[PDB]
């Protein structure tokens, strides 16, 4: 056993490794969206900036899970980061709808990881996940939902441009 | 049997103040409902939300100032149920402002009727308190909501609703 | 038919939050009644008044934070009548604090029952939100009111009530 | 007619002169109370300070009515300022009860003066009285009422001394 290890099940350790890969994947998706809105034929720099920031924070979320794995005495096992499903992401509205589905899948995987901690009595891991991950996912899902509603309200064309200049 | 401060303060004015207190609290509740309606994920107009949040707190403060006045004159505060608002959801920004205009006018008419009670009982100090602290602000509020309605008709639905939120609200 | 944010959020938790919202608003109304009772000319304890004024605004803010949470998770806020408090007047500072202790404990028990609803439906995020944002403060509030009751029994009526107002309150 | 005079009835002018005398009288009463609490055998310096301030403000209330009389074109006619009814004022509680009755009589006389302005259509005088006199009398009567309630609560002896040090 590694020196720190106490009340830390191998199933939780494996679940953290798989969550690490999913955060890195989400980071890659947002990096793709960032560079898509930076295209000369899309050219929405504040949408670009938004996905750049989201890409950096998903990757920080990954690192915080990596730090946690080491803190509890787990061992980090990295896997390929899959490329995103698409090369281009359509309208600002479609990109946000794609983002909502992504954040919800990440949230479901965090809830499943919390279930692993719960069944093995890992009280500290449950609280770590609730405070550091579940709370932010709820805020992020709300924020993307508001974006989708406003993008439907303002419509295509001028409205997409104004939303970029104002909210984003 | 009169309270220590009481002078030139009729029981009908005291009762009228208690009724006005409930109506300010009711209006506060209406605005707090509108605040949270515009905070919904499928409405999501954060500056309309903040406007009704502020309106809800001013109405609650208007209620408290009436409560303080009741005590100052030697009246006794008698609280009643605060009815829930008529609707759970308030439609478009335009419809919500139209609902607000009718509410503020209803509150104004009840303030004017309360002023009439003070007047017929010779309560000079209460008339002036109402004029300076309530009637003046109701006239400003009714004007402001009217301007909002006109601009919301001008900008129309969709992008205009969003721009009004970012600019005026 | 689900709202955009909704995930792992049961209708029973949503209903429980709406019920807790009404109970926080009710407690706010109770404290606002106590605030204005201590502001009466024949009670006239201005620091007890300010204490319940602040308590009334925190309860109203606790209600709003629950309303915001309901929207965040994709629930729909359904408001109900805010019942008037049981009494119009609250007796001595000691009796008012004893009334407050029972109220805060009632609110705490309803928060614990709301936590049980989240727990049985596996709502990990809602349990933590309740623990950090509501249960922790209810425990601090219940302790603080208990200290007030003990000191009010120690100082007794008359001068002691006045000194407690000037010093601790 | 004096140069400024417009819509200013002789009955209002006379009523202001009589209100002037009543404010000066109230000022004299409070000056007596001030010096009574300054006695070596009473010795409550914050009660003394309170009645000193009230004496100064009654006399400022008198001067503001004198200024108003001149503003409207009335002529100030002064009368004897009667000495107060008593030379000594008993307990802090009794002095406050005496003060409440005094402020209420002054308030009733202001309301009667407002009636004179009303029946002669003197809109400006009514508003002057409401804003500058009636509002303050209501605040003063409330404040004295609170004092009486607290003086009954704290009782005689130590309570009188503590009230002097704390509220007064
Ligand atoms: Cu993440
Ligand atoms: Cu837990
Ligand atoms: Cu926890
Ligand atoms: Cu109002
Ligand atoms: Cu609470
Ligand atoms: Cu005066
Ligand atoms: Cu008038
Ligand atoms: Cu006026
Ligand atoms: Na296992
Ligand atoms: Na597993
Ligand atoms: Na690209
Ligand atoms: Na760019
Ligand atoms: Na590795
Ligand atoms: Na959609
Ligand atoms: Na769980
Ligand atoms: Na959020
Ligand atoms: Na947003
Ligand atoms: Na919107
Ligand atoms: Na009547
Ligand atoms: Na009536
Ligand atoms: Na709502
Ligand atoms: Na509702
Ligand atoms: Na409602
Ligand atoms: Na209209
Ligand atoms: Na009305
Ligand atoms: Na159920
Ligand atoms: Na239930
Ligand atoms: Na009261
Ligand atoms: Na009541
Ligand atoms: Na009550
Ligand atoms: Na007890
Ligand atoms: Na309960
Ligand atoms: Na005459
Ligand atoms: Na006369
Ligand atoms: Na003397
Ligand atoms: Na002295
Ligand atoms: Na003279
Ligand atoms: Na008395
Ligand atoms: Na009059
Ligand atoms: Na006052
Ligand atoms: Na006082
Ligand atoms: Na008192």
XYZ file of C-alpha atoms and ligand atoms in Angstrom:
716
model
C 0.000 0.000 0.000
C 1.123 3.562 -0.746
C 1.989 5.663 2.318
C -1.109 7.938 2.380
C -3.688 5.287 1.560
C -6.563 5.010 4.015
C -10.249 4.297 3.309
C -9.540 4.646 -0.441
C -10.940 1.807 -2.550
C -9.403 0.662 -5.863
C -12.787 1.232 -7.513
C -12.711 4.902 -6.477
C -9.118 5.180 -7.726
C -10.168 3.723 -11.087
C -13.189 6.022 -11.233
C -10.999 9.078 -10.681
C -8.660 8.015 -13.500
C -11.633 7.703 -15.825
C -13.037 11.066 -14.697
C -9.607 12.612 -15.360
C -9.810 11.450 -18.968
C -13.332 12.813 -19.351
C -12.309 16.284 -18.095
C -9.361 16.323 -20.503
C -11.729 15.301 -23.300
C -14.141 18.112 -22.434
C -11.168 20.505 -22.422
C -10.295 19.327 -25.928
C -13.871 19.838 -27.148
C -13.870 23.422 -25.866
C -10.450 24.080 -27.385
C -11.883 22.964 -30.740
C -14.884 25.273 -30.311
C -12.564 28.102 -29.286
C -10.582 27.773 -32.519
C -13.745 27.310 -34.576
C -15.149 30.676 -33.493
C -11.699 32.132 -34.274
C -12.079 31.121 -37.939
C -12.143 33.991 -40.431
C -15.518 32.760 -41.727
C -17.043 32.573 -38.218
C -15.215 35.416 -36.453
C -17.034 35.751 -33.111
C -14.138 36.656 -30.784
C -16.097 36.672 -27.523
C -17.608 33.244 -28.130
C -14.016 32.237 -28.916
C -12.858 33.737 -25.618
C -15.635 31.948 -23.695
C -14.652 28.494 -24.969
C -10.954 29.255 -24.442
C -11.716 29.947 -20.765
C -13.904 26.844 -20.505
C -11.129 24.759 -22.071
C -8.629 26.054 -19.486
C -10.996 25.291 -16.575
C -11.851 21.775 -17.698
C -8.130 21.138 -17.857
C -7.722 22.655 -14.385
C -10.576 20.380 -13.250
C -8.555 17.445 -14.616
C -5.440 18.525 -12.736
C -7.329 18.942 -9.472
C -8.522 15.336 -9.829
C -4.927 14.284 -10.586
C -3.754 16.077 -7.429
C -6.517 14.387 -5.447
C -5.555 10.921 -6.713
C -1.994 11.504 -5.476
C -3.227 12.987 -2.192
C -5.215 9.841 -1.387
C -2.427 7.512 -2.515
C -3.904 6.518 -5.854
C -1.843 6.236 -9.020
C -2.649 8.321 -12.089
C -3.109 6.246 -15.245
C -3.580 8.421 -18.331
C -5.333 7.354 -21.537
C -5.615 8.764 -25.051
C -7.601 11.981 -25.210
C -10.116 11.285 -27.974
C -10.530 13.969 -30.602
C -13.942 15.712 -30.556
C -16.826 14.260 -32.552
C -16.925 17.179 -35.015
C -14.410 19.504 -36.641
C -16.883 22.427 -36.783
C -19.749 23.343 -34.533
C -22.379 25.246 -36.555
C -24.104 28.309 -35.157
C -23.455 29.847 -31.727
C -26.795 28.326 -30.714
C -25.824 24.812 -31.867
C -22.425 25.070 -30.152
C -24.124 25.986 -26.866
C -26.611 23.125 -27.238
C -23.651 20.796 -27.848
C -22.011 22.236 -24.720
C -25.107 21.661 -22.582
C -25.165 17.976 -23.523
C -21.439 17.719 -22.809
C -21.696 19.328 -19.363
C -24.649 17.107 -18.487
C -22.731 13.968 -19.421
C -19.775 15.142 -17.332
C -22.186 15.841 -14.473
C -23.745 12.365 -14.748
C -20.259 10.806 -14.656
C -19.411 12.839 -11.536
C -22.633 11.665 -9.891
C -21.679 8.082 -10.760
C -18.229 8.662 -9.234
C -19.883 10.014 -6.088
C -21.929 6.780 -5.976
C -18.700 4.761 -5.982
C -17.347 6.786 -3.052
C -20.660 6.443 -1.199
C -20.931 2.669 -1.417
C -17.345 2.279 -0.167
C -17.902 4.678 2.742
C -15.451 7.300 1.430
C -16.855 10.311 3.251
C -13.962 12.626 2.417
C -14.153 11.829 -1.300
C -17.914 12.469 -1.377
C -17.430 15.901 0.197
C -14.520 16.687 -2.135
C -16.687 15.849 -5.152
C -19.712 17.792 -3.858
C -17.803 20.946 -2.953
C -15.278 20.999 -5.792
C -17.178 19.422 -8.709
C -20.932 18.951 -8.276
C -21.545 22.552 -7.202
C -19.722 23.984 -10.225
C -21.446 21.634 -12.698
C -24.825 22.866 -11.464
C -23.720 26.490 -11.948
C -22.262 25.715 -15.385
C -25.405 23.895 -16.592
C -27.553 26.836 -15.480
C -25.270 29.321 -17.223
C -25.299 27.415 -20.535
C -29.092 27.102 -20.317
C -29.381 30.892 -20.014
C -27.099 31.253 -23.046
C -29.309 28.933 -25.119
C -32.432 30.857 -24.137
C -30.887 34.192 -25.060
C -29.552 32.830 -28.358
C -33.048 31.681 -29.290
C -34.390 35.092 -28.256
C -31.946 37.201 -30.274
C -31.984 34.929 -33.332
C -29.438 34.674 -36.115
C -27.527 37.490 -37.803
C -27.365 40.790 -35.904
C -28.495 39.075 -32.707
C -25.560 36.656 -32.757
C -23.195 39.605 -33.169
C -24.805 41.654 -30.383
C -24.778 38.707 -27.965
C -21.051 38.305 -28.658
C -20.428 41.997 -27.881
C -22.708 42.210 -24.843
C -23.051 39.036 -22.760
C -20.064 37.037 -24.014
C -56.919 54.119 27.376
C -55.049 55.964 24.612
C -51.418 55.228 23.801
C -48.893 57.837 24.989
C -48.195 59.530 21.610
C -51.763 59.614 20.322
C -53.024 63.046 19.311
C -55.290 63.997 16.386
C -55.033 60.390 15.124
C -58.347 58.740 14.242
C -59.052 54.988 14.446
C -60.113 55.090 10.790
C -56.698 56.455 9.771
C -55.027 53.780 11.925
C -57.098 51.071 10.221
C -56.367 52.573 6.808
C -52.626 52.459 7.498
C -52.835 48.770 8.470
C -54.638 48.076 5.188
C -52.036 50.029 3.208
C -49.260 48.079 4.963
C -50.721 44.820 3.672
C -51.017 46.225 0.162
C -47.357 47.324 0.053
C -46.297 43.878 1.279
C -48.498 42.301 -1.398
C -46.931 44.446 -4.125
C -43.484 43.474 -2.806
C -44.471 39.819 -3.152
C -45.702 40.387 -6.723
C -42.368 41.969 -7.664
C -40.385 39.217 -5.970
C -42.335 36.718 -8.081
C -41.497 38.703 -11.231
C -37.849 38.920 -10.171
C -37.609 35.131 -9.932
C -39.606 34.656 -13.137
C -37.071 36.621 -15.166
C -34.346 34.583 -13.412
C -35.750 31.350 -14.917
C -33.439 29.528 -17.326
C -36.101 29.734 -20.060
C -36.613 33.495 -19.587
C -33.118 34.595 -18.532
C -33.282 38.405 -18.629
C -30.988 39.290 -15.700
C -31.528 43.059 -15.760
C -35.315 42.789 -15.793
C -34.716 40.410 -12.875
C -32.657 42.996 -10.975
C -35.234 45.719 -11.679
C -38.032 43.728 -10.019
C -35.658 42.624 -7.255
C -35.077 46.308 -6.457
C -38.801 47.099 -6.790
C -39.620 44.279 -4.382
C -37.264 45.696 -1.749
C -38.545 49.277 -2.140
C -42.143 48.113 -1.664
C -41.088 46.195 1.436
C -39.336 49.344 2.657
C -42.480 51.357 1.875
C -44.387 48.887 4.077
C -41.899 49.300 6.920
C -42.012 53.097 6.762
C -45.805 52.845 7.145
C -45.313 50.463 10.088
C -42.904 52.919 11.711
C -45.384 55.741 11.098
C -48.207 53.774 12.755
C -46.057 53.361 15.884
C -44.967 57.011 15.779
C -48.568 58.250 15.889
C -49.557 55.714 18.530
C -51.400 53.277 16.293
C -51.079 49.513 16.632
C -49.831 47.406 13.728
C -52.187 44.556 12.826
C -50.695 42.281 10.173
C -52.701 40.099 7.782
C -51.916 37.267 5.378
C -49.877 38.369 2.382
C -51.810 36.895 -0.548
C -49.808 35.098 -3.204
C -49.757 36.893 -6.588
C -52.444 36.189 -9.177
C -50.062 34.434 -11.592
C -47.053 32.133 -11.315
C -45.519 33.455 -14.567
C -45.731 36.842 -16.164
C -45.327 36.476 -19.950
C -43.155 38.829 -21.969
C -41.215 41.797 -20.555
C -43.921 43.974 -22.111
C -46.758 42.069 -20.396
C -44.927 42.135 -17.043
C -44.532 45.924 -17.280
C -48.205 46.305 -18.195
C -49.070 44.195 -15.138
C -46.765 46.428 -13.060
C -48.425 49.635 -14.287
C -51.862 48.410 -13.206
C -50.431 47.351 -9.836
C -48.742 50.713 -9.179
C -51.923 52.552 -10.169
C -53.941 50.371 -7.808
C -51.510 51.170 -4.985
C -51.666 54.862 -5.897
C -55.476 54.880 -5.754
C -55.369 53.213 -2.325
C -52.862 55.837 -1.146
C -55.176 58.590 -2.396
C -58.097 56.993 -0.556
C -55.933 56.854 2.588
C -55.152 60.552 2.134
C -58.920 61.231 1.974
C -59.331 59.532 5.351
C -56.659 61.755 6.908
C -58.218 64.833 5.287
C -61.755 64.299 6.535
C -60.449 63.788 10.091
C -58.277 66.926 9.972
C -55.006 65.003 10.184
C -52.695 67.603 8.657
C -49.470 65.824 9.574
C -50.604 62.518 8.071
C -51.676 64.192 4.810
C -48.236 65.772 4.437
C -46.439 62.541 5.342
C -48.418 60.683 2.675
C -47.885 63.408 0.059
C -44.134 63.693 0.558
C -43.276 60.070 1.281
C -45.746 58.118 -0.893
C -47.725 60.153 -3.434
C -44.652 61.852 -4.921
C -42.857 58.546 -5.524
C -45.948 56.804 -6.949
C -46.194 59.521 -9.592
C -42.505 59.055 -10.477
C -42.879 55.261 -10.538
C -45.980 55.355 -12.770
C -44.186 57.656 -15.213
C -41.124 55.406 -15.298
C -43.147 52.234 -15.968
C -45.027 54.068 -18.725
C -41.713 54.930 -20.404
C -40.697 51.261 -20.144
C -43.931 50.120 -21.823
C -43.460 52.595 -24.674
C -39.877 51.505 -25.272
C -40.808 47.811 -25.112
C -43.449 48.405 -27.778
C -40.869 50.305 -29.837
C -38.119 47.673 -29.699
C -40.458 44.703 -30.128
C -39.802 41.069 -29.300
C -36.601 39.072 -29.737
C -33.434 41.148 -30.132
C -35.180 44.275 -28.859
C -36.096 42.610 -25.568
C -32.464 41.568 -25.125
C -31.057 45.002 -26.009
C -33.468 46.787 -23.645
C -32.272 44.472 -20.861
C -28.614 45.334 -21.567
C -29.127 49.063 -22.086
C -31.962 50.632 -20.085
C -32.589 47.937 -17.465
C -40.943 18.069 -21.299
C -38.124 18.660 -18.799
C -36.578 22.084 -18.279
C -33.112 22.586 -19.805
C -31.033 22.336 -16.583
C -32.888 19.435 -14.989
C -30.719 16.474 -14.029
C -30.978 14.213 -10.961
C -33.663 16.559 -9.563
C -36.824 14.846 -8.316
C -40.308 16.423 -8.284
C -40.506 15.667 -4.557
C -37.351 17.714 -3.908
C -38.771 20.520 -6.076
C -42.013 20.469 -4.073
C -40.068 20.358 -0.811
C -38.085 23.444 -1.823
C -41.300 25.354 -2.602
C -42.606 24.434 0.856
C -39.350 25.522 2.505
C -39.511 28.831 0.603
C -42.890 29.576 2.166
C -41.602 28.686 5.620
C -38.606 31.045 5.355
C -40.920 33.839 4.199
C -43.227 33.074 7.131
C -40.341 33.243 9.607
C -39.281 36.555 8.033
C -42.797 37.872 8.633
C -42.720 36.704 12.269
C -39.441 38.556 12.837
C -40.704 41.682 11.103
C -43.670 41.628 13.491
C -41.293 41.313 16.460
C -39.126 44.117 15.073
C -42.102 46.485 14.987
C -43.346 45.276 18.375
C -40.116 46.305 20.079
C -40.377 49.623 18.186
C -43.684 50.409 19.957
C -43.637 53.456 22.233
C -44.747 51.291 25.179
C -42.013 48.684 24.581
C -39.212 50.853 23.171
C -36.188 48.529 23.107
C -34.415 49.756 19.949
C -31.642 47.146 19.884
C -34.024 44.213 20.263
C -35.881 45.939 17.417
C -32.762 46.041 15.225
C -31.951 42.402 16.028
C -35.320 41.190 14.716
C -35.110 43.636 11.806
C -31.843 41.950 10.792
C -33.295 38.470 11.416
C -36.277 39.317 9.222
C -34.008 40.302 6.329
C -31.783 37.211 6.666
C -34.831 34.924 6.565
C -36.068 36.748 3.475
C -32.605 36.306 1.960
C -32.690 32.616 2.924
C -35.990 32.382 1.016
C -34.483 34.044 -2.053
C -31.435 31.770 -2.060
C -33.842 28.803 -2.094
C -35.765 30.442 -4.956
C -32.529 30.918 -6.897
C -31.588 27.296 -6.197
C -34.953 26.050 -7.506
C -34.338 27.898 -10.791
C -30.728 26.689 -10.950
C -31.784 23.032 -10.798
C -34.652 23.565 -13.221
C -37.495 23.568 -10.720
C -40.413 25.983 -10.913
C -41.163 28.349 -8.037
C -44.754 28.111 -6.799
C -45.523 30.761 -4.187
C -48.238 30.491 -1.531
C -49.888 32.874 0.922
C -47.559 34.041 3.673
C -49.606 33.448 6.826
C -49.693 36.240 9.375
C -47.900 35.403 12.654
C -49.780 33.734 15.501
C -49.638 36.801 17.773
C -49.821 40.569 17.337
C -47.578 41.209 20.377
C -44.794 39.158 21.829
C -44.526 39.872 25.577
C -41.187 40.381 27.285
C -37.782 40.190 25.570
C -37.413 36.798 27.258
C -40.740 35.502 25.890
C -39.937 36.804 22.389
C -36.600 34.954 22.416
C -38.306 31.779 23.633
C -40.792 32.149 20.765
C -37.838 32.647 18.391
C -36.060 29.501 19.611
C -39.118 27.353 18.897
C -39.463 28.975 15.465
C -35.813 28.386 14.507
C -36.042 24.776 15.689
C -39.184 24.278 13.619
C -37.394 25.672 10.558
C -34.389 23.459 11.309
C -36.564 20.333 11.504
C -38.166 21.223 8.159
C -34.697 21.702 6.643
C -33.662 18.285 7.965
C -36.797 16.737 6.467
C -35.952 18.438 3.153
C -32.449 16.966 3.366
C -34.033 13.507 3.828
C -35.953 13.996 0.582
C -32.750 14.823 -1.306
C -30.986 11.852 0.303
C -33.552 9.216 -0.601
C -33.538 10.412 -4.231
C -29.727 10.382 -4.449
C -29.446 14.149 -4.862
C -25.869 14.607 -3.667
C -25.559 18.222 -4.783
C -28.772 19.271 -3.035
C -27.729 17.581 0.227
C -24.442 19.495 0.222
C -26.133 22.781 -0.690
C -28.542 22.360 2.225
C -25.783 21.345 4.656
C -23.451 24.219 3.813
C -25.982 26.974 3.185
C -28.793 26.182 5.657
C -28.039 23.512 8.267
C -24.765 25.109 9.396
C -26.384 28.506 9.989
C -29.445 27.054 11.760
C -27.134 25.409 14.287
C -25.328 28.728 14.862
C -28.633 30.612 15.131
C -30.130 28.130 17.622
C -27.011 28.381 19.789
C -27.090 32.180 19.706
C -30.775 32.388 20.697
C -30.108 29.923 23.522
C -27.363 32.208 24.860
C -29.800 35.139 24.680
C -32.429 33.235 26.689
C -29.888 32.324 29.370
C -28.678 35.904 29.698
C -32.238 37.266 29.792
C -33.026 34.891 32.651
C -29.820 35.996 34.384
C -30.409 39.750 34.124
C -34.130 39.573 34.895
C -36.794 42.164 34.180
C -36.556 45.947 34.423
C -33.018 47.353 34.440
C -31.577 44.068 33.184
C -33.750 44.128 30.067
C -32.565 47.672 29.353
C -28.881 46.882 29.950
C -29.010 43.777 27.729
C -30.463 45.960 24.959
C -27.607 48.480 25.298
C -24.812 45.937 25.689
C -25.328 42.626 23.877
C -28.117 43.547 21.449
C -50.161 96.960 3.389
C -46.547 95.858 3.869
C -44.610 95.213 0.646
C -44.529 91.371 0.754
C -48.092 90.832 1.920
C -50.178 88.533 -0.255
C -52.803 85.968 0.807
C -51.781 86.519 4.460
C -54.710 87.110 6.813
C -54.474 89.175 10.025
C -55.796 86.162 11.940
C -52.848 84.061 10.735
C -50.459 86.890 11.646
C -51.950 87.027 15.150
C -51.786 83.244 15.457
C -48.091 83.245 14.573
C -47.372 85.895 17.220
C -49.119 83.757 19.811
C -47.277 80.621 18.658
C -43.998 82.559 18.944
C -44.743 83.229 22.605
C -45.608 79.588 23.235
C -42.303 78.364 21.735
C -40.374 80.858 23.868
C -42.313 79.644 26.908
C -41.473 76.016 26.131
C -37.824 77.062 25.745
C -37.975 78.615 29.211
C -39.494 75.459 30.717
C -36.683 73.335 29.277
C -34.058 75.816 30.456
C -35.490 75.444 33.972
C -35.358 71.646 33.705
C -31.814 71.861 32.350
C -30.665 73.816 35.406
C -32.667 71.597 37.754
C -30.818 68.462 36.646
C -27.590 70.474 37.051
C -28.307 70.915 40.777
C -25.782 69.324 43.130
C -28.599 67.339 44.776
C -29.934 66.040 41.428
C -26.727 65.813 39.379
C -27.788 63.982 36.200
C -25.601 65.717 33.586
C -26.996 63.959 30.514
C -30.602 64.729 31.410
C -29.303 68.277 31.920
C -27.709 68.205 28.466
C -30.926 66.882 26.882
C -33.070 69.733 28.220
C -30.383 72.288 27.334
C -30.579 71.098 23.711
C -34.384 71.089 23.789
C -34.361 74.627 25.197
C -32.106 75.801 22.344
C -34.338 74.176 19.692
C -37.596 75.557 21.048
C -35.977 78.966 20.905
C -34.813 78.266 17.345
C -38.400 77.196 16.573
C -39.519 80.598 17.888
C -37.025 82.432 15.691
C -38.053 80.500 12.592
C -41.645 81.621 13.219
C -40.383 85.196 13.702
C -38.529 84.974 10.374
C -41.663 83.602 8.725
C -43.829 86.443 10.058
C -41.429 88.956 8.485
C -41.214 86.944 5.259
C -44.987 87.097 4.779
C -45.195 90.767 5.762
C -46.555 90.287 9.260
C -45.327 92.277 12.241
C -43.814 90.559 15.269
C -45.491 91.525 18.546
C -43.712 90.030 21.559
C -45.300 89.361 24.953
C -43.999 88.480 28.409
C -42.494 85.013 28.595
C -44.254 83.489 31.601
C -42.068 81.725 34.129
C -42.599 77.935 34.305
C -45.254 76.510 36.613
C -42.712 74.860 38.938
C -39.233 75.648 40.227
C -38.248 71.952 40.452
C -39.337 68.982 38.425
C -39.108 65.832 40.583
C -37.718 62.596 39.203
C -36.396 62.081 35.663
C -39.634 60.186 35.020
C -41.845 63.055 36.244
C -39.845 65.602 34.224
C -40.359 63.537 31.063
C -44.081 63.174 31.785
C -44.237 66.959 32.236
C -42.402 67.322 28.913
C -44.828 65.030 27.086
C -47.786 67.149 28.197
C -45.930 70.304 27.168
C -45.069 69.009 23.688
C -48.646 67.840 23.180
C -50.029 71.256 24.084
C -47.567 72.896 21.689
C -48.627 70.394 19.026
C -52.330 71.138 19.598
C -51.619 74.876 19.270
C -49.752 74.253 15.996
C -52.696 72.225 14.699
C -54.998 75.108 15.643
C -52.689 77.519 13.793
C -52.809 75.246 10.747
C -56.626 75.435 10.966
C -56.429 79.233 10.778
C -54.263 79.035 7.650
C -56.599 76.445 6.116
C -59.815 78.409 6.531
C -58.195 81.502 4.987
C -56.813 79.531 2.031
C -53.158 80.080 2.999
C -51.664 77.116 1.173
C -48.048 78.181 1.640
C -48.479 78.655 5.392
C -50.099 75.221 5.772
C -47.161 73.566 4.006
C -44.651 75.594 6.032
C -46.305 74.448 9.265
C -46.562 70.801 8.156
C -42.979 70.499 6.941
C -41.241 72.660 9.540
C -43.355 72.152 12.683
C -45.922 69.340 12.606
C -43.429 66.715 11.427
C -40.952 67.517 14.207
C -43.635 67.578 16.929
C -44.669 64.055 15.943
C -41.038 62.890 16.161
C -40.533 64.684 19.487
C -43.707 63.224 21.050
C -42.632 59.725 19.998
C -39.146 60.237 21.415
C -40.425 61.463 24.801
C -42.866 58.539 24.935
C -39.965 56.105 24.484
C -38.099 57.898 27.283
C -41.071 57.527 29.648
C -41.372 53.825 28.859
C -37.686 53.207 29.487
C -37.742 55.232 32.713
C -40.595 53.085 34.003
C -38.670 49.976 32.937
C -35.375 50.849 34.630
C -36.979 52.267 37.781
C -35.486 54.619 40.336
C -31.947 54.633 41.717
C -29.330 52.777 39.661
C -31.658 52.697 36.660
C -31.951 56.487 36.561
C -28.157 56.737 36.625
C -27.652 54.114 33.902
C -30.256 55.723 31.629
C -28.393 59.028 32.007
C -25.093 57.373 31.009
C -26.491 55.250 28.179
C -29.461 56.703 26.282
C -29.275 60.350 27.357
Cu -15.236 19.861 -15.367
Cu -23.055 13.491 2.537
Cu -21.013 17.489 2.506
Cu -45.161 51.508 -2.581
Cu -33.703 30.547 7.588
Cu -41.297 73.790 19.116
Cu -52.547 70.257 2.286
Cu -48.117 69.621 1.952
Na -15.491 -2.717 -7.068
Na -17.078 1.294 -11.000
Na -11.544 25.477 -36.370
Na -10.844 35.194 -32.160
Na -0.048 7.408 -17.268
Na -32.535 23.712 -27.213
Na -24.363 9.498 -4.485
Na -24.923 29.888 -12.701
Na -25.322 32.932 -19.120
Na -33.322 35.794 -22.881
Na -64.710 56.375 10.462
Na -62.270 53.905 5.876
Na -40.380 31.905 -11.486
Na -45.862 31.576 -7.866
Na -46.450 34.107 -8.149
Na -50.234 49.076 -23.001
Na -57.040 50.288 -5.418
Na -42.054 11.190 -3.882
Na -42.270 14.816 0.578
Na -46.179 46.154 16.927
Na -49.901 41.703 13.827
Na -48.146 39.778 14.043
Na -36.778 28.748 28.468
Na -41.234 21.688 11.519
Na -60.602 86.210 11.919
Na -57.887 82.785 15.787
Na -32.746 74.534 39.430
Na -24.790 69.310 34.731
Na -42.614 93.448 20.235
Na -46.988 57.999 32.258
Na -55.931 71.813 9.573
Na -38.886 59.984 16.860
Na -36.062 58.201 23.142
Na -37.963 50.196 27.461
